Amino acid sequence: TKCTLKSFTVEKGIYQTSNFRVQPTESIVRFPNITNLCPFGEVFNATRFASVYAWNRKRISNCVADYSVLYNSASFSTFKCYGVSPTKLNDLCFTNVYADSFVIRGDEVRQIAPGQTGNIADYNYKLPDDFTGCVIAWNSNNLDSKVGGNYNYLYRLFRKSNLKPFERDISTEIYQAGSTPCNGVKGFNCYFPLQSYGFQPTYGVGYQPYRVVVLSFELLHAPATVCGPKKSTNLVKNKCVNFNFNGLTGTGVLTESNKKFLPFQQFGRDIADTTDAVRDPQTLEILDITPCSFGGVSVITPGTNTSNQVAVLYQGVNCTEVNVFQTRAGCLIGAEHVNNSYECDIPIGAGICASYQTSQSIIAYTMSLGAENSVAYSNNSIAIPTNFTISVTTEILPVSMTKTSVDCTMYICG
Amino acid sequence: AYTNSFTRGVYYPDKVFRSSVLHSTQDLFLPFFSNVTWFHNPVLPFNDGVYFASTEKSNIIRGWIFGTTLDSKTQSLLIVNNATNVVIKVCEFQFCNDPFLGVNCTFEYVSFKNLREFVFKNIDGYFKIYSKHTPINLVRDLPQGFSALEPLVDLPIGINITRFQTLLAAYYVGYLQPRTFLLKYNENGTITDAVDCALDPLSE
Amino acid sequence: DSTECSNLLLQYGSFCTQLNRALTGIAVEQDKNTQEVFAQVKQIYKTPPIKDFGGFNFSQILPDPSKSKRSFIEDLLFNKVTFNGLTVLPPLLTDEMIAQYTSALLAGTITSGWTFGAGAALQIPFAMQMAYRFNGIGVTQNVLYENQKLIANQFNSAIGKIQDSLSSTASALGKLQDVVNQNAQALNTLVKQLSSNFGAISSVLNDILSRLDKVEAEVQIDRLITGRLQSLQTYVTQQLIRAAEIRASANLAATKMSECVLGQSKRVDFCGKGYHLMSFPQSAPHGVVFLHVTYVPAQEKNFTTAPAICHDGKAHFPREGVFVSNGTHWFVTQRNFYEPQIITTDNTFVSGNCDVVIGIVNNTVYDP
Amino acid sequence: QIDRLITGRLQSLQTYVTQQLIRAAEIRASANLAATKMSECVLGQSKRVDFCGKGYHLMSFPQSAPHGVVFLHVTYVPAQEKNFTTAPAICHDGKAHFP
Amino acid sequence: DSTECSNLLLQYGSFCTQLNRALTGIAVEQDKNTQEVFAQVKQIYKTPP
Ligand SMILES: *[C@@H]1O[C@H](CO)[C@@H](O[C@@H]2O[C@H](CO)[C@@H](O)[C@H](O)[C@H]2NC(C)=O)[C@H](O)[C@H]1NC(C)=O
Ligand SMILES: *[C@@H]1O[C@H](CO)[C@@H](O[C@@H]2O[C@H](CO)[C@@H](O)[C@H](O)[C@H]2NC(C)=O)[C@H](O)[C@H]1NC(C)=O
Ligand SMILES: *[C@@H]1O[C@H](CO)[C@@H](O[C@@H]2O[C@H](CO)[C@@H](O)[C@H](O)[C@H]2NC(C)=O)[C@H](O)[C@H]1NC(C)=O
Ligand SMILES: *[C@@H]1O[C@H](CO)[C@@H](O[C@@H]2O[C@H](CO)[C@@H](O)[C@H](O)[C@H]2NC(C)=O)[C@H](O)[C@H]1NC(C)=O
Ligand SMILES: *[C@@H]1O[C@H](CO)[C@@H](O[C@@H]2O[C@H](CO)[C@@H](O)[C@H](O)[C@H]2NC(C)=O)[C@H](O)[C@H]1NC(C)=O
Ligand SMILES: *[C@@H]1O[C@H](CO)[C@@H](O)[C@H](O)[C@H]1NC(C)=O
Ligand SMILES: *[C@@H]1O[C@H](CO)[C@@H](O)[C@H](O)[C@H]1NC(C)=O
Ligand SMILES: *[C@@H]1O[C@H](CO)[C@@H](O)[C@H](O)[C@H]1NC(C)=O
Ligand SMILES: *[C@@H]1O[C@H](CO)[C@@H](O)[C@H](O)[C@H]1NC(C)=O
Ligand SMILES: *[C@@H]1O[C@H](CO)[C@@H](O)[C@H](O)[C@H]1NC(C)=O
Ligand SMILES: *[C@@H]1O[C@H](CO)[C@@H](O)[C@H](O)[C@H]1NC(C)=O
Ligand SMILES: *[C@@H]1O[C@H](CO)[C@@H](O)[C@H](O)[C@H]1NC(C)=O
Ligand SMILES: *[C@@H]1O[C@H](CO)[C@@H](O)[C@H](O)[C@H]1NC(C)=O
Ligand SMILES: *[C@@H]1O[C@H](CO)[C@@H](O)[C@H](O)[C@H]1NC(C)=O
Ligand SMILES: *[C@@H]1O[C@H](CO)[C@@H](O)[C@H](O)[C@H]1NC(C)=O
Ligand SMILES: *[C@@H]1O[C@H](CO)[C@@H](O)[C@H](O)[C@H]1NC(C)=O
Ligand SMILES: *[C@@H]1O[C@H](CO)[C@@H](O)[C@H](O)[C@H]1NC(C)=O
Ligand SMILES: *[C@@H]1O[C@H](CO)[C@@H](O)[C@H](O)[C@H]1NC(C)=O
């Protein structure tokens, strides 16, 4: 109170010094049942991929991309990412997502990075130099090698010019590398533009095939059709909580309700457009919202030039939330309730007043309106005054304020 | 041909419950007492959005196509009431003018005595569909009375639309205009009446 | 309760304190307004168990113990009038305490007349109190005692018409209902202004903080702070202006309590139309109702009149009355009710000879 | 930056002048009442109940005070009543007499 | 009379409506003020010839 009034002395009164507010005891998050998980498993367990000169792209759209199975997929011989950290991906959203898939030898998987060079990076699959995405691989010797060599996997050995980023080209005309004419046939500097790894199961670890998939992500004007998993908490009724139901953030108390929403409606609004009810997206019950209990806190005091005891009123708060006493104005702490009634000293509200009285304490009482009297009425009886008092009464009226002027330029601009 | 719309083409504009209250909102609505084109399958302008209605129980009426070219040069939205359930797809389609009874792809989804009413609109790359069904006493024109249309789907398709056509025996078309309406929500949070604020000075 | 917004709101300084000091003065004034009207009685007077009020029937306006303990008319009045950091506060006096004040004022008035406002309540029989209130309008007190049944009836009937009006009407009490309506509309306007953008990216504070990084989010929140602080200053300024109107109305109601209920006002049209007899307070939601009892002169006749009359060359003037003639005979009457006395040397006084007065007439003055 | 200080200091001064206009209207209503109390209580003898203090008004005396006025209202208060039987009229030679 | 400005003013909500409502309350009260002073007489009394 001394700090609120900016004074070391406080006169008799009731002063508001704070606001009480019950705090959110925990956070709730609720979203629909975690469903329509993206088809990443259809690429990562395909029967085989395409040859790297003709890499195969999966469109990922309209699903939840839970990358956490990939975060724990320790069978991946690598899981690199560029522009973005892998652990962050479960927080994100995108318009389109892609997975680009192929087989190559381990000694050429190292060409799959931003700004790399060599026949794969030059002529088969060029990443951007500012690439945002991820590169995944696993050993596939037992899947992609064959006795006498599996020639069914190929790469573009040479081209007239290097690929642009994500340029795809599956044409197989003879490449004329120099002054010797191609003449429609294989020869020196008349190369058929593809060659094969010929994968043998007896190959060494860098000669062996690896299955490779490159993840890539974009966010456009068109809607974010791909998002991470909406992990959700338990639902906590009958306490103060923070909550998030779908996009509806707030703070309050959640309770069961008598309301009858229509099947498409998600939440409800009061007459002034303030939200007051919600449908839980996992179990479709209607919950009422009421605010966390709050109100002004007032300090009730005799003057400090008499005593240093005080009482405290929590305006409109029920005493469960905070001698101690429930008034209709709010819970009152530190005042003794009395069964007598007296004229009002300090006013509290709803018929209650407080005073400091004699060993001394602050007391709280229902206010006296005046002494009760029955006038001795009947027909044919009268009272007539036999004496008088001349009385002098004082009345005090304001007539004028202190006169003020302001140089508005000197106040504003100094 | 033209007929009057009366007080029809109101829909629940948002997924918000409101009870025993009057709420004023601005959205693409069919203006009250406007007239609507009546048909017995042309390509039509879409404007900002369409109210479509019909009386149907044979299912001669079967679906719609929406787009700019509608065909080949860029993607378009196909909708068909297959008797199993409604089928929806978005592709660079090149199908025929309309299928009839003997009287690349980027998105996909799978779900007379009665007047059946549908509202279609496109906002910021989401395609919104609302509908309702009611019995009717007189098939010739839309009935004088009130009934709010409920949302079916809210599709993230992103593609542009400026024209549409019916796939299909008679139906009504009118266009949604940006209007302010005052909507009456009863104790059960159904819309039960409305005022089209720009209709007349009493409505203002 | 956003910590990001709360720290920006500190940069605006004292505005948030001085708005609460302003609204606190409005709230504290409403208790003083109610105190200055109703608390004008020193002691809680109560009515006798006997009801010997001379045929006048106050049972419609007196407390009912079977009811709060309001009168019948106070229950009609109480039935016919009908959270984003916002709080309402209770009044200091409860509706039952206000009814104890209108009870004490009314019991004092009926049992002791005007006397309880000037000192101790002195009992007087109600028909004799009404005889003095007839003298206070210039009608001689025998006009009451000779017509007491007819004045007690017709008072009772005029009170019955108050019950029938307040039971049947749907507009007459609307002066209190409009004060309820303006204060509901003011809080709904203040709350609806939370939905406004004020040119910010959104009106939802967590939405702003999700879309934008710290430096741009701080720019967007300062628009909501600017518009919401202007929205709250607009409300508090309008409540300060609206409270000044209610205080002027409460000072008028406190003056009608003193001069109409505790007295008999001679001020024209102050305590209803007609010559004022008395009035009764009844409590109502956020206000007071006065039932102003007045005398109305009702069935006039024309007479010939003269300013003075000649006797033995002396001009006679009436002491209190006016001279009138029925066409052949001359009388003096009291002025506000026709009652003809024969003209005498003690109904009249002399001043000079006949010749000065314009329109003097010749008639005998009887000397008793 | 100066435009933010101008905006806030100008709003600060508008708030002050608005509340001084609203407060000066309250002090004018009080000065109009004090001027009426001087005409009716000091320059006359008011019959208006409780206008010039409690009891029946005799006279009142003005005293100056800083920013205001003080009225010393002299009034007559009846003090020591006794009970009596009473009658509205008395009957003499078959005729009613009134006081 | 600018549509470009009117759609920006509409971001401020109730302010424009409540300014018009305040001036309408002031205007209706001026007719009330005049009737409370002058309309105190029930009948249009006329002086004799
Ligand atoms: C969300 O998923 C939960 C868990 O499967 C569903 O809740 C169960 O629904 C079945 C329906 O037969 C009940 O038998 C169970 O008692 C429910 N509770 C639990 C804890 O399993 C819920 O129905 C789903 N909600 C939606 C909207 O799909
Ligand atoms: C005072 O007036 C009331 C009128 O309300 C009288 O009570 C009613 O009397 C009528 C007959 O005159 C009855 O039909 C009603 O049932 C009575 N009750 C009510 C609540 O109206 C009352 O009797 C009168 N008192 C005196 C002493 O005459
Ligand atoms: C004065 O006016 C009253 C009415 O205000 C007259 O009293 C009425 O007289 C008729 C006679 O038939 C009765 O039917 C009514 O019931 C009476 N009313 C009341 C309330 O008692 C009265 O007669 C008039 N007196 C004079 C001298 O004109
Ligand atoms: C004017 O008033 C007087 C007195 O009331 C009337 O005179 C009386 O008239 C009646 C007959 O109508 C006689 O019985 C009385 O003896 C008369 N008294 C006196 C004192 O003369 C007179 O009639 C009235 N005049 C008119 C024109 O009405
Ligand atoms: C009132 O009475 C007086 C006295 O009887 C009348 O005075 C007479 O008036 C006539 C006409 O002017 C004169 O001829 C007489 O000489 C007067 N007599 C006296 C003694 O003065 C007077 O006229 C009467 N007034 C009226 C209006 O008739
Ligand atoms: C392949 O399918 C299995 C099925 O159990 C699954 O566990 C695994 O995560 C999938 N992906 C890889 C890279 O193994
Ligand atoms: C403080 O209280 C004392 C009595 O306790 C009194 O005499 C004195 O005037 C008061 N004020 C100051 C400033 O001491
Ligand atoms: C407040 O809470 C308690 C316990 O829930 C309840 O008994 C009490 O009645 C409430 N307060 C009031 C003023 O009713
Ligand atoms: C106050 O009165 C109530 C009954 O009216 C009683 O229960 C209570 O014990 C009393 N308290 C004191 C302090 O006497
Ligand atoms: C009141 O009047 C009644 C009936 O006339 C009578 O019996 C009673 O004595 C009177 N009371 C007084 C105190 O005069
Ligand atoms: C009247 O009251 C005064 C005191 O105010 C007292 O001195 C005087 O004796 C009283 N007179 C009578 C006759 O009672
Ligand atoms: C339909 O409305 C247009 C509005 O301009 C009007 O010209 C036309 O006559 C109307 N037709 C019918 C048949 O209602
Ligand atoms: C639609 O009709 C065809 C046969 O014409 C049927 O094969 C198909 O399953 C139906 N569509 C759906 C979504 O079931
Ligand atoms: C939609 O239309 C706009 C304007 O013609 C154009 O910028 C945009 O690229 C179009 N989008 C599609 C998917 O056709
Ligand atoms: C609302 O629903 C209840 C059952 O939940 C039903 O009794 C009532 O008739 C419905 N209609 C209205 C107008 O309340
Ligand atoms: C007689 O009195 C009535 C009622 O006041 C009045 O209307 C009438 O004009 C008067 N007679 C004459 C002749 O003026
Ligand atoms: C009153 O006026 C009439 C004319 O209407 C006139 O004859 C008469 O003498 C006048 N009387 C007085 C006292 O002026
Ligand atoms: C008058 O009568 C009442 C009731 O009989 C009694 O209490 C009172 O003492 C009497 N005297 C005075 C001075 O009021």
In DSSP terms, B126 is beta-bridged to B123
Asked if D49's CB is within 8 angstroms of C259's CB, the reply is: yes
**CATH number of the domain where residue B94 is located:** 2.60.120.960
* CB-CB neighbours of B175 under 10 Å: 19
The residue written with tokens 């900016």 in the block is A6
Other Cβ atoms within 10 Å of B172 Cβ, number: 24
> How many other C-beta atoms lie within 10 A of the C-beta of residue E42?
7
Structure tokens at C65: 């113990």
Give the separation between CA C126 and CA A377, rounded to whole angstroms. 9
Instruction: Write the burial class of residue A343 (CB in 10 Å: 0-12 exposed, 13-18 middle, 19+ buried).
Output: exposed
How many alpha carbons fall within 13 Å on the CB side of residue C289?
23
What backbone torsions phi and psi does residue B110 show, to the nearest 5 degrees? -135, 135
Per the CB < 8 A criterion, the answer to whether A68 and A230 are in contact is no
Question: Is C in contact with E (3 or more beta carbon pairs below 8 Å)?
Answer: yes
* Tokens representing residue C185 in the block: 């509309």
Query: Could you tell me if C89 lies within 8 Å of chain A, comparing CB atoms?
Result: yes
How many domains is chain B partitioned into structurally?
A: 1
What does the DSSP 8-state code read for residue C9?
H
Buried/exposed A119-146: b ≥16 CB within 10 Å, e otherwise: bbbbbbbbbeeebebbbbbbbbbeebbe
3-state secondary structure string, C95-160?
Answer: HHHHHHHHHHHHHHHHHHCCHHHCCCCCCCCHHHHHHHHHHCCCCCCHHHHCCHHHHHHHHHHHHH
Q: How far is the CA of B188 from the centre of ligand 15 (A)?
A: 6
**A45 in contact with ligand 6, CB cutoff 6 A:** yes
Strand partners, C45: A373
Ligand 12 pocket (Cβ < 6 Å) reads B 2, 35
And the tokens for C4? Answer: 């990001």
CA nearest neighbour of A397 among D32, D2, D49 = D32
Contact C315, C354 (CB under 8 A): yes
Breaks in chain D listed by the residue before each, with C–N > 2.5 Å: none
Could you write out the three-class secondary structure of B146-202?
CCCEEEEEEECCCCCCCEEEEECCCEEEEECEEEEEEEEECCCCCEEEEEECCCCCC
Q: Give A281: exposed, middle or buried? Use CB within 10 Å, 0-12, 13-18, 19+.
A: middle
Give the pairing of strands A311-315 and B114-123: unpaired
Report how far Cα C121 is from the mean position of its chain's Cα atoms. Answer: 22
Tell me which H or E stretch contains C350.
strand C348-353
Size of the A and B interface in Cβ pairs below 8 Å: 54
Of residues B166, A77, A294, B30, the one with CA closest to residue C84: A294
Nearest 5 degrees, angle CA A226-CA A228-CA A234?
135
Tokens, residue A349? 């509200």
Nearest CB to E13: which of C196, C238, C269? C196
Q: Are A58 and A98 in contact (CB under 8 A)?
A: yes
Helix (H) or strand (E) holding E24: helix E15-38
DSSP line for C189-245:
HHHHTTS--TTSS-S-HHHHHHHS-HHHHHHHHHHHHHHHHHHHHHHHHHHHHHHHH
Contacts of A59 in chain B (CB under 8 A): 106
Token pair of B107 as six digits: 């998105």
What is the DSSP code (8-state) at residue A37? B
Q: Considering only CA atoms, which of C262, C298, C293, C267 is closest in space to residue C279?
A: C293
Residue E36, token pair as written in the block: 């409370």
Residues 6 or more apart in contact with residue C325 via CB below 8 angstroms:
C303, C304, C305, C306, C331
Alpha-carbon separation of residue C184 from A271, B18, B161, C20 (angstroms): 11, 19, 46, 19
Residues from chain A contacting residue C89 (CB–CB below 8 Å): 315-316, 329, 349
Q: How far apart, in whole angstroms, are the C-alpha atoms of residue C168 and residue C160?
A: 12
User: Between chains, do A375 and C112 touch, taking CB under 8 Å as contact?
Assistant: yes
Q: Interface of chain C against chain D, CB under 8 Å?
A: 12, 15, 18, 22, 40, 114-115, 117-120, 122-125, 127-128, 131, 140-142, 145, 233, 237, 240-241, 244, 247-248, 258-259, 262-263, 265-267
Looking only at the bridges linking them, the beta strands covering D90-91 and A275-279 are unpaired
Other Cβ atoms less than 10 A from the Cβ of A225: the count is 21
Which sign, positive or negative, has the C-alpha torsion C145, C150, C151, C153?
positive
Nearest in space to A175 (alpha carbons), one of A167, A166, A165, A185: A185
Residue of D nearest to C125 (CA): D86
Is B87 a pocket residue for ligand 13 (Cβ < 6 Å)?
yes
Q: What is the total residue count of chain C?
A: 368
Are A391 and D75 inside 8 Å of each other by CB? yes
CB contact under 8 A, E11 and C196: yes
A190-191 and A175-176 beta bridge pairing: antiparallel
Q: Do C258 and D96 touch (CB under 8 A)?
A: no
Write the CB contacts of B138 (distance below 8 Å, at least 6 apart in sequence): none
Q: Measure the CA–CA gap between B107 and A59, rounded to whole angstroms.
A: 11
Does residue C135 contact residue C143 with C-beta atoms inside 8 Å?
Answer: no
CA distance A248 to A283: 17
The rounded distance, in Å, linking the Cα atoms of A202 and A217 is 37
Distance, CA C65 to ligand 2 centroid (Å)?
16
- Domain extent for B24: 2-204
Rg (Cα) of chain D, in Å, rounded? 27
Name the token pair of A158: 């040479």
The β-bridge partners of B182 are B24, B195
CA distances from B144 to A50, A85, A401, B181 (A): 63, 61, 68, 18
CB C350 within 8 A of CB C359: no
The closest residue, in CA terms, to atom 4 on ligand 12 is B35
Place of tokens 């003809």: C340
Among the listed residues B8, B15, B58, the one whose alpha carbon sits nearest the alpha carbon of residue B34: B8
Q: Are strands A63-64 and A226-227 parallel, antiparallel or unpaired?
A: parallel
> What approach was used to elucidate this structure?
cryo-EM
- Report the run of H or E that residue C26 belongs to, with start and end: helix C15-38
Compute how many other C-beta atoms are within 10 angstroms of the C-beta atom of residue D29.
15
Q: What single-letter DSSP state applies at residue D42?
A: I
**In contact, D73 and A392? CB cutoff 8 Å:** yes
Using CA atoms in the order A142, A146, A147, A149, what is the torsion angle rounded to 10 degrees? Answer: -130
